[PDB]
C-alpha cells in the first residue's frame, strides 16, 4: 500500500495473508467470507507469464494477523487449503478478466475479535455504493513504494473513478468485470495498492446497515500511485453468482 497508514488493531478482521512456504514470503492478500472460504485474485495463484502456478500444498493461509512477520500467539490462526477454485473464464493471457478465485480451508476457522468474515454485496448495496467518487478501503502487506515492505498491515481509502477516465488512463482493454479507484492528479491526495497487495479486499461500509461489504479485489495496476494511473479491482458483485455456485456446490 502506497501513501497509506498503519491499520488499527481489529480494523480488517477479514484480511487474510497468503503465505508461500518455500521460499518464505508473502504471496498475496485475500479475504475471509465464511468460516471455511477465502476469496482472492486468480492471478495470485495462476499467472503463467510470470511462471505462477501454485497448488494447495504450496501455500499457508494466516488469518487474524497484523504484523507482517511476527508470530502473533493466540491471535493469528494458520490454516491449510483443501481446494483452490479459479474462475473457469479467468483470462490470464490478456487482461486478467474475471480475476477471482476461491480457497476452501481444510478446517473451519474460529471467529474472534481479530477474525471475522466480510459481507458480499446484495443488489441494492452494490447499486447504492458503486458510484464515482465514493471511497472504498484497501488493505495489505504489499510494498510501500513502487521501487520497502511494511512492518504491519497498511490501509488506504480511495475513491471509485468514472469508467471513461479509467479507460482513458490505460492501453489495456477494460471489461465490465473491473473497476478502478484512486485520486486524480488534480485532487492532491494520493494512495494505491502495490506489489503484494494483490488479492486483498476493496471494502465499503454500508451507511444503511453499518456493515462492511467487499466490492472489489486488488487485481492489477500500472506501477503504484503514479499520477494519471489508477488501480484496477475485480468487480465482486458481477461475479457473485459464480462465488455462490462454488460454495453451494463444493462446500
Amino acid at each position: 500500500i502506497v501513501e497509506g497508514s498503519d491499520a488499527e488493531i481489529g480494523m480488517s478482521p477479514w484480511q487474510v495473508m497468503l503465505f508461500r512456504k518455500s521460499p518464505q514470503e508473502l504471496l498475496c492478500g485475500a479475504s475471509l467470507i465464511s468460516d471455511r472460504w477465502v476469496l482472492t485474485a486468480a492471478h495470485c495463484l495462476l499467472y503463467p507469464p510470470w511462471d505462477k502456478n501454485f497448488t494447495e500444498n504450496d501455500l499457508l493461509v494466516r488469518i487474524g494477523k497484523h504484523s507482517r512477520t511476527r508470530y502473533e500467539r493466540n491471535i493469528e490462526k494458520i490454516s491449510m487449503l483443501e481446494k483452490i477454485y479459479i474462475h473457469p473464464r479467468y483470462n490470464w493471457r490478456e487482461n486478467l478478466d474475471r480475476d477471482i478465485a476461491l480457497m476452501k480451508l481444510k478446517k473451519p476457522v474460529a471467529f474472534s475479535d481479530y477474525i471475522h468474515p466480510v459481507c458480499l454485496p446484495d443488489r441494492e448495496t452494490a447499486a447504492s455504493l458503486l458510484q464515482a467518487g465514493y471511497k472504498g478501503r484497501v488493505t495489505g502487506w504489499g510494498n510501500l513504494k513502487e521501487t520497502g515492505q511494511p512492518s504491519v498491515l497498511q490501509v488506504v481509502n480511495l475513491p471509485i473513478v468514472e469508467r471513461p477516465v479509467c479507460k482513458d488512463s490505460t492501453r489495456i482493454r477494460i471489461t465490465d468485470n473491473m473497476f478502478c479507484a484512486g485520486y486524480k492528479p488534480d485532487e492532491g491526495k494520493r494512495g494505491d495498492a502495490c506489489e503484494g497487495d494483490s488479492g486483498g479486499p476493496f471494502v465499503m461500509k454500508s451507511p444503511f446497515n453499518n456493515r462492511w461489504y467487499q466490492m472489489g479485489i486488488v487485481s492489477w495496476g500500472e506501477g503504484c500511485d503514479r499520477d494519471g494511473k489508477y488501480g484496477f479491482y475485480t468487480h465482486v458483485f458481477r461475479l457473485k453468482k459464480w462465488i455462490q455456485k462454488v460454495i453451494d456446490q463444493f462446500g
Binding site: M11, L120, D122, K135, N210, Y213, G251
Partner: protein, 36 residues
C-alpha cells in the same frame, strides 16, 4: 444458500460491535454524501 454470507458478516468485534468508530471510516461515509 450462501447468499451474501454470514448473518453476522461485516460487523467488526472491536468497532461496530462496541459502537466505536475507526480513525478514517468517517472519510468513507462522508464520500457517500452526494454534492450539488
Amino acid at each position: 444458500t450462501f447468499g451474501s454470507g454470514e448473518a453476522d458478516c461485516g460487523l467488526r468485534p472491536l468497532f461496530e460491535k462496541k459502537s466505536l468508530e475507526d480513525k478514517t471510516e468517517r472519510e468513507l461515509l462522508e464520500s457517500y454524501i452526494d454534492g450539488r
